[PDB]
């Protein structure tokens with residue numbers, strides 16, 4: 001219903017618990033979470049396509065894409081869909097997240113369970129670098145930790 005969780009983890013010590021609450025069917029999805037064990041400062045953060053998390057987040061795909069849009073974030077509109085941009089981490093390597101998005105829904109029609117977030121090392125460039133990985137991921141970093149959105153209720 002309203003709630004889902006994503007256990008971000010990888011090989012690295014970076015692990016995080018994301019939480020989703022949709023307080024309605026068409027209302028925004030309040031995302032909040034804590035990632036623990038990355039470097040400080042801005043970390044690119046977005047939704048990827050994977051779902052077949054059979055063994056682990058090996059071949060986590062590019063950013064989930066509805067039709068065709070480049071990469072972006074909270075500057076451009078030519079953002080894939082799951083492009084949140086980037087989030088700040090404290091010096092201990094703890095990134096807090098607490099915001100509300102209108103671009104997805106875990107309740108109602110599309111019920112976006114399963115989806116694989118990936119947390120990146122460096123800040124999302126907003127795909128301004130002007131190379132494939134800028135336009136694909138915003139040159140954000142080689143997929144530090146990731147998981148899948150599991151229904152909570």
Ligand SMILES: [Cu+2]
Pocket residue numbers: 044045046047048117118119120137
């Ligand atoms: Cu990403």
Ligand SMILES: [Zn+2]
Pocket residue numbers: 046063070071072079080081082083136137138
């Ligand atoms: Zn993107």
